[PDB]
Coordinates of C-alpha atoms and ligand atoms in Angstrom, one line a residue:
X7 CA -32.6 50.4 10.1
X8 CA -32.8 46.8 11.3
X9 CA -33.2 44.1 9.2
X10 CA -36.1 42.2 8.7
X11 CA -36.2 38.7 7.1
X12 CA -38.3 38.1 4.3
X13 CA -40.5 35.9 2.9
X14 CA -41.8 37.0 -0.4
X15 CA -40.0 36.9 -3.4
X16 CA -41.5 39.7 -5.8
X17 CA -39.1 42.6 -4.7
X18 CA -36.4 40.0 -5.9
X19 CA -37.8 39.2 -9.0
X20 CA -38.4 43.0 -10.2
X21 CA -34.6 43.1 -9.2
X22 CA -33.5 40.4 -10.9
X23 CA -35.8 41.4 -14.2
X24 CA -33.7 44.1 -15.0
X25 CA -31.3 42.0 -16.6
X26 CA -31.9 39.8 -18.7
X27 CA -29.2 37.1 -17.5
X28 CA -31.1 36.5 -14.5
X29 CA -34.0 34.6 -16.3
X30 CA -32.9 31.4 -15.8
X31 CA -32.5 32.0 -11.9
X32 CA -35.9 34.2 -11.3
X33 CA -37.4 30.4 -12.8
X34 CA -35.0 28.7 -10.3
X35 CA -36.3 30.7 -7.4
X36 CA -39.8 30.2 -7.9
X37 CA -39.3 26.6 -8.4
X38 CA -37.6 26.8 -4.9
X39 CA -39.4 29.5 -2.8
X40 CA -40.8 26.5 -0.4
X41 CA -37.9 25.6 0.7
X42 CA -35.8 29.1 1.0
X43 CA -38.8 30.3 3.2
X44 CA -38.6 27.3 5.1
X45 CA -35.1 27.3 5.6
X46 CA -35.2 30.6 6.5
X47 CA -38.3 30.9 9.0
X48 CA -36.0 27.5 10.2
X49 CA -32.6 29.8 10.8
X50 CA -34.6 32.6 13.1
X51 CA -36.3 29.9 15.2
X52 CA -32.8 28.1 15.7
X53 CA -30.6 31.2 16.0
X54 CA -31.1 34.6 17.3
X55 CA -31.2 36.8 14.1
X56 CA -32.9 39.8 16.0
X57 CA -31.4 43.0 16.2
X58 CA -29.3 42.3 12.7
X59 CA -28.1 46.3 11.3
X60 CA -29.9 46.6 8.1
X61 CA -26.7 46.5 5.1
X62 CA -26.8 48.5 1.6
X63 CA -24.8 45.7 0.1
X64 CA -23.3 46.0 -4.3
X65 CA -23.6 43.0 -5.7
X66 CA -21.6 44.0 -9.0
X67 CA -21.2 41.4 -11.9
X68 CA -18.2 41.9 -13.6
X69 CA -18.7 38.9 -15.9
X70 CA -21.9 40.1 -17.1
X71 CA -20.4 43.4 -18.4
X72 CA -19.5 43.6 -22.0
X73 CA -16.0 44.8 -21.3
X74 CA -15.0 41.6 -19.7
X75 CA -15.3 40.0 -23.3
X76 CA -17.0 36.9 -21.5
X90 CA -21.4 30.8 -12.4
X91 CA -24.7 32.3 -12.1
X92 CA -26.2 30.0 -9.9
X93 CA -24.1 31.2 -7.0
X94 CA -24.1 34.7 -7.6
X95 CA -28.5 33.6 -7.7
X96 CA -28.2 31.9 -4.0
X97 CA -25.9 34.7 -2.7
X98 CA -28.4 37.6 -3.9
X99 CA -31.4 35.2 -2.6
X100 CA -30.1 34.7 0.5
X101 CA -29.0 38.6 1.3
X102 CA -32.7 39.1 0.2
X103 CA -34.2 36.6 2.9
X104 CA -31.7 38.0 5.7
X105 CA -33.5 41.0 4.7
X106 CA -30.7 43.5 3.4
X107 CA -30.7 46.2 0.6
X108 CA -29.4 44.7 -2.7
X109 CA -28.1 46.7 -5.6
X110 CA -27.3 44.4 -8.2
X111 CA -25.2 45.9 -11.3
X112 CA -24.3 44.4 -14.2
X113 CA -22.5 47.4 -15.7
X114 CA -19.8 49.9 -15.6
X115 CA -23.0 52.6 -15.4
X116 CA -24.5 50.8 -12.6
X117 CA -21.9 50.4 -11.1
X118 CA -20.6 53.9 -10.8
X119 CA -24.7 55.1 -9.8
X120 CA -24.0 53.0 -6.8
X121 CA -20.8 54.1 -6.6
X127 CA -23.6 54.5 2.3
X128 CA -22.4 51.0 0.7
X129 CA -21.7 48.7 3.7
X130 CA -20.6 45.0 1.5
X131 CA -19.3 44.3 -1.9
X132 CA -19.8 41.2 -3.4
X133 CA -18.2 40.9 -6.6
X134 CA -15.4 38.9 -8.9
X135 CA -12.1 39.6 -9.9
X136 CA -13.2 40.9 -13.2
X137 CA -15.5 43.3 -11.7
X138 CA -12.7 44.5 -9.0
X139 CA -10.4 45.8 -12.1
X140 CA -13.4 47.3 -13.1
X141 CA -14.0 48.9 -9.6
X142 CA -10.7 49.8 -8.8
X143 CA -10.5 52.1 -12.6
X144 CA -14.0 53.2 -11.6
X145 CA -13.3 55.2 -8.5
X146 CA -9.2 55.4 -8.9
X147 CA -7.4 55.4 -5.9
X148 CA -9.9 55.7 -2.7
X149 CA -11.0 52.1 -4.4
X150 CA -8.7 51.0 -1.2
X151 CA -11.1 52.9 1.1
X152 CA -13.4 50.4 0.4
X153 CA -11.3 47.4 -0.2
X154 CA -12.0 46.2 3.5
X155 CA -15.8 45.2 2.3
X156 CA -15.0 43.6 -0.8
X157 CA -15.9 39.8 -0.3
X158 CA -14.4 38.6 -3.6
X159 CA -16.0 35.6 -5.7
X160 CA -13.5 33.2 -6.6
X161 CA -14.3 30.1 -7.8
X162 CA -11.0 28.1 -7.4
X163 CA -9.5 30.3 -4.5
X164 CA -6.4 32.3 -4.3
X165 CA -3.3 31.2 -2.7
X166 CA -1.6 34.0 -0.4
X167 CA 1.5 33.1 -2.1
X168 CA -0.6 34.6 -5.2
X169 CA -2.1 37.4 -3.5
X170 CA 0.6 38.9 -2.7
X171 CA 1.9 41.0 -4.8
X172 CA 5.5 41.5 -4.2
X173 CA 6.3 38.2 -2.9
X174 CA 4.4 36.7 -6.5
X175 CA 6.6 38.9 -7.9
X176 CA 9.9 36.9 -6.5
X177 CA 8.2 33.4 -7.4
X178 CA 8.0 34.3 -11.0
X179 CA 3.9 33.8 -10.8
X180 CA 2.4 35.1 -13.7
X181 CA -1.4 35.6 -12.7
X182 CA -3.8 37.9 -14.3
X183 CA -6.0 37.0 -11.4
X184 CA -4.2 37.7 -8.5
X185 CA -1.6 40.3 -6.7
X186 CA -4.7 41.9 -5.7
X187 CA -3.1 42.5 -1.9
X188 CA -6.3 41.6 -0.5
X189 CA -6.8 39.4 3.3
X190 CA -7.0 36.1 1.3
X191 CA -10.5 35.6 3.7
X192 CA -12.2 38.0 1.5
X193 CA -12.3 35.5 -1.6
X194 CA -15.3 33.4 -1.4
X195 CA -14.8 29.8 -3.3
X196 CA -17.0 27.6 -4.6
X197 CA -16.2 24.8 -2.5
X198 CA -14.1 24.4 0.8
X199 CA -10.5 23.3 -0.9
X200 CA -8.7 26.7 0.3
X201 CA -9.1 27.3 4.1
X202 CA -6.9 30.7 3.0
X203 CA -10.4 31.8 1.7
X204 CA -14.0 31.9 3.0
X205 CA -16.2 29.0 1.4
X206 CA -19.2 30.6 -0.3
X207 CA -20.3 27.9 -2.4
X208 CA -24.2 27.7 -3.1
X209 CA -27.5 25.7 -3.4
X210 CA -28.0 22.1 -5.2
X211 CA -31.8 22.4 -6.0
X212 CA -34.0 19.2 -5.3
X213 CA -36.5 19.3 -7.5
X214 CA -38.5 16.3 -6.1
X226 CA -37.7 2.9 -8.3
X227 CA -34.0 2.8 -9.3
X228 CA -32.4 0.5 -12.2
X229 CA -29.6 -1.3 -13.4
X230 CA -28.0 2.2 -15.1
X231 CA -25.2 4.1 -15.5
X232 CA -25.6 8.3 -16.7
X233 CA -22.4 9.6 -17.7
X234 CA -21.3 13.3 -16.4
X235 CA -20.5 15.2 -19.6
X236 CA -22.7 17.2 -21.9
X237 CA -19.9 17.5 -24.6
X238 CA -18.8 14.4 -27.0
X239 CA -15.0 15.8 -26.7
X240 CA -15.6 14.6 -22.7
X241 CA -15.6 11.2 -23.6
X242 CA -12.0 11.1 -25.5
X243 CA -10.3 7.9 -24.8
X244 CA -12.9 7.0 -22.3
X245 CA -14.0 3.9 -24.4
X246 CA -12.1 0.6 -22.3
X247 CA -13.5 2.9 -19.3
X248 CA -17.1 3.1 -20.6
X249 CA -16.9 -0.3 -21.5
X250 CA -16.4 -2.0 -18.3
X251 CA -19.2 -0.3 -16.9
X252 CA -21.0 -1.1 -20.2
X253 CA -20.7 -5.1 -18.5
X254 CA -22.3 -4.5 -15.8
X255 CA -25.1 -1.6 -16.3
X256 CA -26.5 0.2 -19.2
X257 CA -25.6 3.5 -20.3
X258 CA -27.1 6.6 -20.5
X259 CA -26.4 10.0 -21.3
X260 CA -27.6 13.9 -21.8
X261 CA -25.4 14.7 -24.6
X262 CA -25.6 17.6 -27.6
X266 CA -21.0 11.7 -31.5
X267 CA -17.6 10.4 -32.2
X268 CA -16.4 9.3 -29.1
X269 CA -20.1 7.7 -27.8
X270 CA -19.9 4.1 -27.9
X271 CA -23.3 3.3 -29.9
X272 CA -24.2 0.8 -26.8
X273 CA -25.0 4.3 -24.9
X274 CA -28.8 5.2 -24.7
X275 CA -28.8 9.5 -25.4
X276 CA -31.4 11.0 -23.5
X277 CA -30.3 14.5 -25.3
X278 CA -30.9 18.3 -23.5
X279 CA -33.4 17.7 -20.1
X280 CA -34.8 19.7 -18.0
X281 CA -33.7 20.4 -14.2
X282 CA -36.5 18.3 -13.4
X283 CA -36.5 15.8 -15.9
X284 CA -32.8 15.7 -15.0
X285 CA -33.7 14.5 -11.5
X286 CA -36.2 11.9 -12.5
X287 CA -33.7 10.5 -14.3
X288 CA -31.4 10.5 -11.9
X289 CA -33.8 8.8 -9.5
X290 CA -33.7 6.2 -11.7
X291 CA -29.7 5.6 -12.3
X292 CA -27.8 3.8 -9.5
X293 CA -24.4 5.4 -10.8
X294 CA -23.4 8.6 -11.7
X295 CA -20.4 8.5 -13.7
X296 CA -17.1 11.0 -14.3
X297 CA -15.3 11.1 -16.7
X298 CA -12.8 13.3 -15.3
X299 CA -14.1 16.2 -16.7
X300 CA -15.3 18.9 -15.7
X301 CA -13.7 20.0 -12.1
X302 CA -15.6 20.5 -9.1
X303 CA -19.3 21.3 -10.1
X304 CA -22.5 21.0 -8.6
X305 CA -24.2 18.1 -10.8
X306 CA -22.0 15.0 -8.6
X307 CA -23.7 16.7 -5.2
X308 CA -27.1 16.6 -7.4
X309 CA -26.3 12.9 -8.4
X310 CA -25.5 12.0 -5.1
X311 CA -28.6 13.9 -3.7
X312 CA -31.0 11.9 -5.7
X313 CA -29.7 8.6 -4.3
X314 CA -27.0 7.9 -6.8
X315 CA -23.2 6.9 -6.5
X316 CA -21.1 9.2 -8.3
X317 CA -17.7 7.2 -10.0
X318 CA -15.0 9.6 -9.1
X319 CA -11.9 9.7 -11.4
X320 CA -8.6 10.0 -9.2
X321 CA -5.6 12.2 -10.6
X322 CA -2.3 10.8 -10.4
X323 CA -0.7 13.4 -10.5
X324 CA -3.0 15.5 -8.5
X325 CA -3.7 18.3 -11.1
X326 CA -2.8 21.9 -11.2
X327 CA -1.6 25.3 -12.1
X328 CA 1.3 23.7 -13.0
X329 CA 0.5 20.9 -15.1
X330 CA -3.0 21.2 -16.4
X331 CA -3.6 23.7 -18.4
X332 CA -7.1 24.4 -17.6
X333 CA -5.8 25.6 -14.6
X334 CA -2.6 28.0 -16.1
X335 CA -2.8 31.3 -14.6
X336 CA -4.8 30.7 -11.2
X337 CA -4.2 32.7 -8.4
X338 CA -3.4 29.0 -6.7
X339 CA -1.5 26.0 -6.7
X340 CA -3.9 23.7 -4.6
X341 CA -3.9 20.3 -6.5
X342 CA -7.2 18.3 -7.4
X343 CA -6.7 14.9 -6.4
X344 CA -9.9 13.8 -8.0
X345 CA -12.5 15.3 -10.6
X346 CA -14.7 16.3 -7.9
X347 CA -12.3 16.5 -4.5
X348 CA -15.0 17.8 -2.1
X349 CA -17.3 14.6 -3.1
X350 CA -14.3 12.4 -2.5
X351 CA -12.8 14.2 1.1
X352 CA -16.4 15.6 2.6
X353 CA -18.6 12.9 1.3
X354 CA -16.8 9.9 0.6
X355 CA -18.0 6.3 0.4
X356 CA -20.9 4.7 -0.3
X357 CA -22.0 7.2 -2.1
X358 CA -18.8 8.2 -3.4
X359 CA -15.9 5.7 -5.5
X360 CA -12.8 7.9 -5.9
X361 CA -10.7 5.4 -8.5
X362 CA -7.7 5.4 -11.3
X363 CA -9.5 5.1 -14.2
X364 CA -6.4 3.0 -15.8
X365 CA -7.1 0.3 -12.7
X366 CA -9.8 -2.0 -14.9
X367 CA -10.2 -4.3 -12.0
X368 CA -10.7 -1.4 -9.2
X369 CA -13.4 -0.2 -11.6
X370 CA -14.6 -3.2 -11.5
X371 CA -14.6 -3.7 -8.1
X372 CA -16.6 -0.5 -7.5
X373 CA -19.2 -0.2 -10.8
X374 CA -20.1 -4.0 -9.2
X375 CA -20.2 -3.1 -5.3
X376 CA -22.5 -0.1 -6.4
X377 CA -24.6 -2.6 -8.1
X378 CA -26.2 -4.4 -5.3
X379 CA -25.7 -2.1 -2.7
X380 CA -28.3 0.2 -1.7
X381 CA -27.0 3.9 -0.7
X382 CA -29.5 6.6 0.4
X383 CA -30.0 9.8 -0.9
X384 CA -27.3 12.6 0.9
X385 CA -26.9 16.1 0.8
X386 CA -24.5 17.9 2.9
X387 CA -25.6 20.6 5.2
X388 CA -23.6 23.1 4.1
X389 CA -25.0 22.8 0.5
X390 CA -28.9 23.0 1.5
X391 CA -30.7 26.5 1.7
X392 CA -30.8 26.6 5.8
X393 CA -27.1 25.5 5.7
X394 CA -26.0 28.9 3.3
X395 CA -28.4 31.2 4.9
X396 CA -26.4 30.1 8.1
X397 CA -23.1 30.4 6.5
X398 CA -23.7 33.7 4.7
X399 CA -25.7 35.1 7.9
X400 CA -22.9 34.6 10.1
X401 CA -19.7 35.9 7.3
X402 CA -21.9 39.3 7.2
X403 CA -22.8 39.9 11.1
X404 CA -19.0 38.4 11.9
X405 CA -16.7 38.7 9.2
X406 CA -14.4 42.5 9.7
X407 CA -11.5 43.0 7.7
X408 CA -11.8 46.9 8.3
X409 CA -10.0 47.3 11.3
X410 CA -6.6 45.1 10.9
X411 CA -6.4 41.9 12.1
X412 CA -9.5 39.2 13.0
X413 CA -11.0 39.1 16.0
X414 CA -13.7 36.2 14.5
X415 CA -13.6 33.0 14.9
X416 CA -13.0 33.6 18.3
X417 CA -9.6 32.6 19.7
X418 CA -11.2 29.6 22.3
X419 CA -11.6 27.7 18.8
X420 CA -7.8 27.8 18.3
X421 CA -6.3 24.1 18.1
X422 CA -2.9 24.2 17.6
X423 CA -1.2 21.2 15.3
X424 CA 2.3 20.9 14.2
X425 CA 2.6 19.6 10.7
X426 CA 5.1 16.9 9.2
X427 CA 8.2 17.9 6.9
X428 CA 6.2 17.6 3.5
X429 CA 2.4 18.3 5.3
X430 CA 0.6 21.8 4.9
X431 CA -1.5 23.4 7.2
X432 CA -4.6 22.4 5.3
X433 CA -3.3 18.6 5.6
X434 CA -2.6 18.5 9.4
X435 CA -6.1 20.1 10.4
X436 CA -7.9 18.8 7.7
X437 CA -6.2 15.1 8.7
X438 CA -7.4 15.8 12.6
X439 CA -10.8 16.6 11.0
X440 CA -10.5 20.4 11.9
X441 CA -9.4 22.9 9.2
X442 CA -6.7 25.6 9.0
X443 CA -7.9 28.9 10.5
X444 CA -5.5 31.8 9.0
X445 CA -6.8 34.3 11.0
X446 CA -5.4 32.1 14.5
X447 CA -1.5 32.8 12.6
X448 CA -1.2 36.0 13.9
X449 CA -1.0 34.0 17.5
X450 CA 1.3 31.3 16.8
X451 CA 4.2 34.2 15.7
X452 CA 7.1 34.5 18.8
X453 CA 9.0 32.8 21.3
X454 CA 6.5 33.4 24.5
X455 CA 3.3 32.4 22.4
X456 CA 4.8 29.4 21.6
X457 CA 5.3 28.4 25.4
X458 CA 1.5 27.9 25.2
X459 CA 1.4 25.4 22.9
X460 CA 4.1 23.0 23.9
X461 CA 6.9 24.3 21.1
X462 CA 10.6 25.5 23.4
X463 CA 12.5 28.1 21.0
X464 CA 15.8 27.6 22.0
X465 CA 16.6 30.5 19.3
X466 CA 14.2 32.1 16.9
X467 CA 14.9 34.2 13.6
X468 CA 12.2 35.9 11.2
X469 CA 11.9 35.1 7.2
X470 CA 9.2 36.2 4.9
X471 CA 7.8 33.2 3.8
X472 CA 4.6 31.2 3.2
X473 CA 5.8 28.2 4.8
X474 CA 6.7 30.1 8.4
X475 CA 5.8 30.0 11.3
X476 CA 8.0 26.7 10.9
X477 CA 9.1 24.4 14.0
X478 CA 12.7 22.3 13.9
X479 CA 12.4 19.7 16.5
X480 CA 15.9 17.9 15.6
X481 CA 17.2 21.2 16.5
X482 CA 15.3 23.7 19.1
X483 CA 14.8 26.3 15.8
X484 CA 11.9 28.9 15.4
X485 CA 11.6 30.7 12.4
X486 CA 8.7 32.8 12.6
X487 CA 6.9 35.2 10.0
X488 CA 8.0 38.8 9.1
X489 CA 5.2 39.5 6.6
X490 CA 2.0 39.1 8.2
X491 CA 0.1 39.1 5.1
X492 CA 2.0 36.0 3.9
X493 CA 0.2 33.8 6.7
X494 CA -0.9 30.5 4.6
X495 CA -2.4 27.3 5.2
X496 CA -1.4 26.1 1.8
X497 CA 2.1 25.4 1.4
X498 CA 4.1 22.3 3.1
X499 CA 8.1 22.4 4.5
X500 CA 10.7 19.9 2.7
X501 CA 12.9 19.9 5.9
X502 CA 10.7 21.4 9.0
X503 CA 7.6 21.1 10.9
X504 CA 4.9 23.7 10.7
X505 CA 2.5 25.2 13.0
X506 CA -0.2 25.2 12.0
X507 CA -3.6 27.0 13.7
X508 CA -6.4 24.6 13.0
X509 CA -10.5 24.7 14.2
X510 CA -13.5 22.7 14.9
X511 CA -16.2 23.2 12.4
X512 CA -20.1 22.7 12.8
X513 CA -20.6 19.3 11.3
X514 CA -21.3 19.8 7.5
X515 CA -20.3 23.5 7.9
X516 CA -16.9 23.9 7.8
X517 CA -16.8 27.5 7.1
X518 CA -18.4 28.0 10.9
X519 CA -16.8 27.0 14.2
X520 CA -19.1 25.4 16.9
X521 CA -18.6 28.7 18.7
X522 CA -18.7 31.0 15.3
X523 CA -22.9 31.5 15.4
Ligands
LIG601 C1 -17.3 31.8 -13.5 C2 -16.0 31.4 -12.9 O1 -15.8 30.2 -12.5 N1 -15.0 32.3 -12.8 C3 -13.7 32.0 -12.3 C4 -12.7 32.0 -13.4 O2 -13.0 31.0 -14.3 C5 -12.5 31.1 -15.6 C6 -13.3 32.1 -16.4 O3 -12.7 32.4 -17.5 C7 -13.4 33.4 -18.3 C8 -12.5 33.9 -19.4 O4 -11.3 34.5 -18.7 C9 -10.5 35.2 -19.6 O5 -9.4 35.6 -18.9 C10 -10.0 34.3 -20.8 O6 -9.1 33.3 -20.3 C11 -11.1 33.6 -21.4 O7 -10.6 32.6 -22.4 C12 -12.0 32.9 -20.4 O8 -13.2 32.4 -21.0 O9 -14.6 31.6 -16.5 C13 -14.7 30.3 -17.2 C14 -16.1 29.9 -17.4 S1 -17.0 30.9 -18.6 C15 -13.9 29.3 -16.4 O10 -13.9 28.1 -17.1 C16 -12.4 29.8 -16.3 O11 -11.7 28.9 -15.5 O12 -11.4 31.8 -12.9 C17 -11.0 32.8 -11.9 C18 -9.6 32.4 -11.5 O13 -9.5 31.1 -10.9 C19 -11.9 32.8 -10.8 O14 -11.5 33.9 -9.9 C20 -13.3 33.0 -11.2 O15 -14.3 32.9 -10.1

């Protein structure tokens, strides 16, 4: 009943046969079974993964299923690396499988598929809500998850009110510190020229982008991997390549460049992983729920302050130029500076096969959300930081370069456990409210929080000072503490 790590792939790719989606990803897997075995034969000689319990864990789809009416390469590395940590898979891609399965330990699933589960077994779906680890690609705000108080914000989300501990939704990069980070696997597949390759597949990308392209146009040539009226006819069309072709190509470009659309995806990381510099488009405004309407109807109000925020906060120069697009001459500045200079090829940790199969091994032998409150990360990784009038949680930690631990609130919430941390209440009250447990320092005042499940990082005071309960991170893991393995 133990588990036992494997190192052969052809259970998995029986598994994954079964439907037909998946035949992409059984091609992916093949193409990186090297370097999952490695990573993994890597984790048990680093870590002690011995005595791990053996989990019957759902992996349930609710995308795939037809009565969604609508990506994959995460739901690919998170099945991959539950299969290498040795654990019992049941994918389903159906409301058939998925009440045959419904002895079930974890639930990985999305939104779409937790309607589907909650109308599947009626009300004890909340006896298993506990193991539901939710994938969500852009987060979900607490503000959002709870029901009642997104009831009295006026937040109209399809997505949300789901009631959930906001820990249990997995994102697709580390922008919500409310949620876990799940994120996944940018596949390597592997002399360098004067070149520019544009991000964007689609011709309606490149919209206005024409005094943009054309500076860059000065300086290199460029290329792109396109499906016509908006491509300058100066740009050299590589058309639809290969992953692999893709990469040689890449190899051979010295910029890799945005056009501010699409948000957060994994082909920057693969740019900048093949020894490119990635041209980041800054937002000003940052963009949102509120004023892009891409993003109308998220469970979130986090703002992108770039096209690809995690390149420009986690990665950052020289690999990556996070610029205003309408600032000719700081484009200039940067397409030239790339020119001669000479970046090596980076990948962060936290984005390589050893660095998920850590972060995924420790969320299922650490992560419980069946027994109230969090016990993990453990309370010595608690670093307490008051936040500025107008700062959130995530700002102060992330600033301090820690991040906002939600599960450390529940210790920052009355007069005598404020003593510890260097904050006198002269005279505390209680509000239900994201933006408590606040601090007023011109005036000895506590307010502290009355709803426990409306603990958030996000979220900044006009007028007081948070506290905020921040935590080191392995370097290029920030989902793990130091002390989290
Ligand atoms: C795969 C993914 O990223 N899913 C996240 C989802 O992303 C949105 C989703 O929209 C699908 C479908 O949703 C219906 O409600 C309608 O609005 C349809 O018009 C829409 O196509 O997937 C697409 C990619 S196919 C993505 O572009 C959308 O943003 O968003 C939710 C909420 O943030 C997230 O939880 C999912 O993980």
């Amino acid at each position: 009943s133990l588990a036992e790590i494997r190192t052969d792939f052809n259970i998995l790719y029986s598994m994954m046969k079964k439907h037909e989606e998946f035949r992409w990803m059984r091609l992916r897997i093949r193409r990186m079974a090297d370097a999952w075995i490695q990573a993994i034969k890597s984790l048990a000689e680093k870590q002690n993964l011995e005595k791990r319990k053996r989990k019957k864990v759902l992996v349930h789809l609710g995308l795939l299923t037809k009565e969604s009416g609508f990506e994959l390469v995460q739901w690919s590395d998170l099945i991959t690396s539950l299969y290498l940590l040795g654990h019992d898979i049941r994918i389903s891609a159906s409301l058939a499988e998925l009440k045959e399965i419904m002895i079930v330990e974890l639930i990985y699933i999305d939104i779409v598929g937790l309607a589907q589960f909650k109308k599947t077994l009626g009300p004890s779906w909340v006896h298993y809500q506990c193991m539901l680890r939710v994938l969500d690609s852009f987060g979900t705000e607490p503000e959002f998850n709870h029901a009642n108080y997104a009831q009295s914000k006026g937040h109209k989300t399809p997505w949300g009110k789901w009631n959930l501990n906001p820990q249990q939704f997995y994102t697709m990069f580390p922008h919500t510190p409310d949620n876990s980070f799940l994120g996944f696997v940018v596949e390597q597949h592997l002399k360098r020229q004067n070149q520019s390759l544009v991000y964007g597949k689609v011709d309606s990308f490149w919209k206005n982008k024409k005094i943009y392209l054309d500076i860059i146009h000065t300086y290199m040539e460029v290329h792109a991997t396109v499906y016509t009226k908006n491509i300058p006819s100066y740009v050299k069309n590589h058309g639809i390549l290969s992953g692999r072709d893709l990469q040689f190509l890449l190899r051979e470009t010295k910029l890799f460049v945005g056009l501010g659309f699409p948000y957060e995806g994994p082909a920057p990381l693969e740019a900048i992983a093949n020894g490119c510099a990635f041209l980041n488009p800054k937002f000003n405004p940052p963009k949102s729920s509120k004023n892009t309407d891409f993003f109308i109807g998220k469970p979130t109000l986090r703002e992108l302050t770039s096209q690809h925020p995690y390149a420009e906060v986690f990665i950052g120069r020289p690999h990556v130029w996070t610029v205003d697009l309408n600032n000719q001459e700081e484009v200039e500045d940067a397409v030239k500076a790339i020119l001669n200079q000479k970046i090596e090829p980076y990948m962060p940790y936290e984005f390589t096969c050893e660095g998920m199969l850590q972060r995924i091994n420790a969320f299922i032998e650490k992560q419980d959300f069946c027994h109230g409150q969090v016990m993990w990360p453990p309370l010595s990784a608690l670093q307490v930081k008051l936040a500025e009038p107008g700062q959130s949680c995530k700002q102060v930690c992330q600033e301090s370069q820690l991040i906002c631990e939600p599960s450390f609130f529940q210790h920052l919430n009355k007069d005598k456990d404020m003593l510890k941390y260097k904050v006198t209440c002269q005279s505390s009250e209680l509000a239900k409210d994201i933006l408590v447990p606040s601090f007023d320092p011109k005036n000895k005042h506590c307010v502290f929080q009355g709803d426990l499940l409306l603990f958030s990082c996000a979220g900044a005071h006009p007028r007081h000072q948070r506290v905020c309960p921040c935590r080191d991170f392995i370097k290029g893991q920030v989902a793990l503490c130091k002390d989290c393995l």
